[PDB]
């Protein structure tokens, strides 16, 4: 047979940028030109800070989380003590101050102020205002690899069809208490930060029309999602985009007969591609030049930082 023939001095912006990620809101740290993104494009960064003083319904384990989604500080859900989220329970939005100004009133006009937003950091803080003998319970936190996916299914109709919509995945890791977490006496408060989900700092496009999730007309069973998401009034609040950030998960157990009152800080630095028309467009400067020192520092800090830390 015949064989065949086959023919130490990181740029100052990564100094101000790195400080955006793990520097408290009391340091009054500035957003900086942006990220030492390979990209040099035009962008306007903004540091979102929100202070919320609140009380916890006793005997109720209130579960809160930080949203990699722009415009909302966190989501609140509540349930019986010792219980976890359920298909019946729904989450309530709690947007950042001045939300309405950048996304407007209609779910469809979310897009005009800016095309896309890329996350910088996502931090949260808890401070207890409870006296010593009136307080009770514990705080517990773990992060979740929640990404925005899409589910496809066929619903009979004449003519019949297979409409498919967005569905969040990784919500199943939201019921059970994460293996790597921080748990402490409610009173000792707690502080935590979130890191980039991907190695690339790509710009996540802004979306429109999404108010609820599962979206209306869809069974929570046909979506696979463990529970529901209250978009809330479209004009008051909405979800525009999903950031490539690990979502944080905090729950506070309020034993029976205990009053727990504490303040809540939540901030995050972000970069958005300003609309030519937008007012905000005039503050924008260019994404600082790519610096290798700070880009590697940002990552070395992510793995070194503990899940959560004491309030003090």
């Amino acid at each position: 047979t015949a064989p065949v023939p086959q023919q130490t001095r990181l740029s100052q912006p990564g100094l101000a940028f790195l400080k955006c990620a793990f520097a408290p809101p009391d340091f009054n740290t500035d957003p900086g030109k942006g990220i030492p993104d390979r990209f040099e494009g035009k962008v306007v960064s903004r540091k979102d800070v929100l202070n919320q003083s609140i009380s916890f319904t006793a005997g109720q384990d209130t579960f809160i989380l930080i949203a990699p989604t722009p415009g909302v500080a966190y989501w609140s859900a509540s349930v019986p003590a010792g219980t976890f989220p359920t298909s019946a329970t729904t989450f309530n939005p709690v947007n950042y101050p001045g939300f309405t100004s950048m996304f407007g009133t209609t779910s469809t006009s979310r897009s005009n102020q800016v095309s896309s937003f890329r996350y910088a950091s996502m931090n949260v803080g808890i401070y207890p205002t409870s006296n010593l003998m009136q307080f009770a319970g514990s705080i517990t936190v773990w992060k979740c690899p929640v990404k925005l996916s899409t589910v496809q299914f066929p619903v009979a109709t004449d003519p019949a069809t297979s409409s498919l919509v967005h569905t969040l995945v990784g919500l199943n890791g939201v019921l059970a208490v994460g293996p790597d977490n921080f748990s402490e006496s409610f009173i000792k408060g707690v502080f935590s930060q979130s890191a980039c989900n991907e190695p690339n700092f790509q710009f996540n496009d802004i979306l429109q029309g999404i108010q609820t999730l599962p979206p209306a007309n869809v069974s929570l069973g046909s979506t696979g999602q463990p529970f529901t998401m209250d978009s809330g009034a479209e004009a008051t609040s909405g979800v525009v985009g999903w950031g490539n950030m690990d979502t944080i998960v905090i729950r506070v157990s309020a034993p029976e007969g205990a009053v727990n009152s504490a303040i809540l800080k939540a901030w995050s630095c972000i970069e958005y591609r300003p609309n030519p028309n937008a007012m905000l467009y005039q503050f924008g400067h260019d994404s600082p030049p790519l610096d290798e020192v700070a880009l590697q520092e940002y990552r070395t800090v992510a793995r070194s930082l503990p899940v959560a830390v004491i309030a003090a």
């Binding site: 793990f22 520097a23 070395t300 800090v301 070194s304």
Partner: peptide
């Protein structure tokens, strides 16, 4: 923060 600022360990290494």
């Amino acid at each position: 923060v600022k360990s290494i």
